[PDB]
Structure formats: structure tokens, C-alpha cells
Design a protein around this ligand. Structure first.
Ligand SMILES: [Cl-]
Length: 127
RNA sequence: UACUAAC
């Protein structure tokens, strides 16, 4: 969008051992691309901790190597309404990560299942 | 709940 942009800060200090980035991206980044279609926004994960140590920097989009800010979703839209819907769907995911009772995060279960399909390691047993 | 890495 580029006309309207906002940063949604991820509560890393409060939850230092929750993997928010993985829950947002999903297998192959597919969850984040769905969130973008949901909100009609471009969404990027940026800031300190948004890049695995240490990725092929020369293969990264502009601005991705700026770690001055804490971890955030950068939301970009071409109306204020869309931008706010983008903040909403990111906040939804953050809330899901923190308030899901152990083992009841359906989004994450589905993600890990789909990941296993892609890696050919799917199992459907109780062990 | 197979631990995700998009642009
Ligand atoms: Cl079996």
C-alpha cells in the first residue's frame, strides 16, 4: 500500500520464549500470506530477531536488515481502514499465541501438520 | 503441537 503504514510491536519481553515469528509465517510463509489477503495489507516481519542468524543478507528485501527497532509487524495499506484491519489480524495471532491453553492452539497444530506433509514426515499415531 | 521463515 505504502500510503498508510504502522508498526505492531510483538510482546517479546513479556513472552521471551514464545515463537511468534513462526506462528505468524507458517510453513513456507503461507500463514502470513493468508493474513495479508484477509486484511488487504502488505505485512512484513521486521526488527530485532526477525532474521535467523545468519541469513543470506544479499537475498533479503529492502529494509529487512534494519534491526534498530524491536520485533514488529510492519503493516502497509492504501487506506486507514485497511491498515487497521491489518493490525487487527496480527493482534489476533499474538493473542492466540498467548491465550491458547497448552495443546489447544489449532492454528499451530495445523501448521505443524502441513509442515510435516511438505517434509514427508507426517505421522498420525499416539506415540 | 511434526516447531514453521515469507517479502
Ligand atoms: Cl502405526
Amino acid at each position: 500500500p505504502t500510503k498508510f503504514q504502522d508498526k505492531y510491536y510483538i510482546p517479546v519481553d513479556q513472552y521471551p520464549d514464545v515463537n511468534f515469528v513462526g506462528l505468524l509465517l507458517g510453513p513456507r510463509g503461507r500463514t502470513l500470506r493468508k493474513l495479508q489477503e484477509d486484511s488487504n495489507c502488505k505485512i512484513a516481519i521486521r526488527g530485532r530477531g526477525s532474521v535467523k542468524e545468519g541469513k543470506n543478507a544479499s537475498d533479503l528485501p529492502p529494509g529487512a536488515m534494519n534491526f534498530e527497532d524491536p520485533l514488529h509487524c510492519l503493516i502497509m495499506a492504501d487506506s486507514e481502514d485497511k491498515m487497521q484491519k491489518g493490525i487487527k489480524v496480527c493482534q489476533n495471532i499474538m493473542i492466540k499465541a498467548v491465550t491458547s491453553p497448552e495443546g489447544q492452539n489449532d492454528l499451530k497444530r495445523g501448521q505443524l501438520r502441513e509442515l510435516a506433509e511438505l517434509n514427508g514426515t507426517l505421522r498420525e499415531d499416539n506415540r
